[PDB]
Ligand binder design. Structure first.
Ligand SMILES: CC(=O)Nc1ccc(C)c2c1CCCN2
Ligand SMILES: CC(=O)Nc1ccc(C)c2c1CCCN2
Lengths: 245, 178
């Protein structure tokens, strides 16, 4: 993550991020809505950061330092560039909605009143088709990635030294290879929980309640499609095992 | 320090997310209670042994039967949660959650945890449950279910007051080390 965004999302909540004199100007219901929207953006910032650790620290480090067999790095990190593109674009839109909403003379005081339309756009049309296709592929290759990682760590000395070296810093404590893969797989099922709670505090404007209700339906449609399109790939699985599923 | 993995399972309203949040912060949040839990690696020392215990939530995966099992690989201990204010959450334990965890996590110890124990003597809870001819889950009902499903043990806690929270994770660490 970049320093500007880290500082903007350093506080535990929207109510602690904004100046207390600005917080005092809003009703309790607006504070509750803004705290959940802040959690959505803050967790999206961290998810994009998990994808950058996978692409830049792990994937690129293995290509530039190790002599792994061709197709091994792709098996460890399936769809990472596509995932990074989807979420970096979505994060850009959330951060621009926050930035446009800032009060003149402030880099921290804002209220986002129209999140619904942004979520409908993210979870419909071509972007939803790409999220569905990418997660159906990623999640079907999840078990194969974990097994390939375990094999390499146990049998390749240079691989073990590389992993131990780049995961040693305390800031990587939660982000080993397997932990990154599970963080990415779990991300998509966090959206309905966050969206439903934002909807709970967005009844003040009927257009907004309607838009978030539509977005929540689209996210659930996407999840059901991804869940139905998953079948774990297995290295060495025979055709007979597959057609007898 | 050896690394162990813990996953918490249970119905959507069982309080699993709250339990992970309160343990990881060692505090019930005073300003904002997070909606979700990403992951955490707790440094725990139990009976003289140092462990890094990675914590994972299954919240949000309850309706997705192909996504949810992806949380189980290499799990060392399962926390199987129900809410004491919800006898319905206890009824889903023996023939939905238990056979699933035994299938994907064979030989992994399961600790059955009764969450929200502070609601056992909550008058609003008692009145609301009495409308559906119900009452808060009794301690013997929790122990009997844990015995029946072959759980490693039975424990109770309250994320709201923090009572019992530390003991649950220290015991889970002991189970993971066996
Ligand atoms: C309980 C907790 O820790 N967070 C929280 C707070 C409020 C709501 C509506 C909610 C959650 C968690 C997922 C379901 N909905
Ligand atoms: C997602 C999935 O496959 N769950 C699963 C696996 C195995 C058994 C026996 C079982 C379940 C679900 C509850 C009933 N019994």
């Amino acid at each position: 993550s970049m320093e500007m965004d880290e500082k903007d999302f350093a506080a535990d909540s929207w109510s602690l991020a904004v100046d207390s004199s600005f917080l005092q100007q809003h009703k309790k219901e607006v504070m509750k809505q803004q705290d959940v929207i802040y959690e959505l953006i803050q967790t999206e910032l961290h998810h994009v950061r998990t994808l950058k650790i996978m692409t830049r620290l792990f994937r690129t480090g293995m290509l530039e330092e190790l002599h792994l067999e061709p197709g091994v790095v792709q098996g460890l990190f399936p769809c990472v560039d596509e995932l990074s593109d989807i979420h970096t674009r979505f994060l850009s839109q959330l951060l621009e909605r926050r930035r446009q909403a800032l009060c003149p003379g402030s880099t921290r005081n804002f209220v986002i009143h129209r999140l619904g339309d942004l979520l409908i756009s993210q979870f419909s049309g071509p972007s939803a088709e790409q999220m569905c296709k990418t997660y159906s592929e990623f999640c079907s290759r999840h078990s194969k990635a974990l097994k390939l990682y375990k094999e390499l760590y146990a049998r390749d000395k240079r691989f073990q030294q590389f992993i131990r070296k780049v995961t040693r810093p305390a800031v990587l404590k939660r982000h080993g290879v397997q932990e990154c893969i599970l963080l990415v797989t779990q991300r998509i099922t966090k959206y309905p929980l966050l969206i439903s709670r934002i909807l709970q505090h967005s009844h003040g404007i009927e257009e907004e309640r309607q838009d978030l209700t539509t977005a929540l339906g689209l996210v659930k449609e996407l999840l059901s499609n991804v869940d139905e399109g998953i079948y774990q790939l297995e290295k060495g699985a025979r055709l007979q095992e597959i057609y007898n599923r | 320090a050896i690394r162990k993995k813990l996953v918490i399972v249970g119905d959507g309203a069982c309080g699993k997310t709250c339990l992970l949040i309160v343990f990881s912060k060692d505090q019930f949040p005073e300003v904002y209670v997070p909606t979700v839990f990403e992951n955490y690696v707790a440094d725990i020392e139990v009976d003289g042994k140092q462990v890094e215990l990675a914590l994972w939530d299954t919240a949000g995966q309850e309706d997705y039967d192909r996504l949810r099992p992806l949380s189980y690989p290499d799990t060392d201990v399962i926390l199987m949660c129900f809410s004491i204010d919800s006898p319905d959450s206890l009824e889903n334990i023996p023939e939905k959650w238990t056979p699933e965890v035994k299938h994907f996590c064979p030989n992994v110890p399961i600790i059955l945890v009764g969450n929200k124990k502070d609601l056992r003597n909550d008058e609003h809870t008692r009145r609301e449950l009495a409308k559906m001819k119900q009452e808060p889950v009794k301690p013997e009902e929790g122990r009997d279910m844990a015995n029946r499903i072959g759980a490693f043990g039975y424990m109770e806690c309250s994320a709201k007051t923090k009572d019992g929270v530390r003991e649950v994770f220290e015991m889970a660490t002991r189970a993971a080390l066996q």
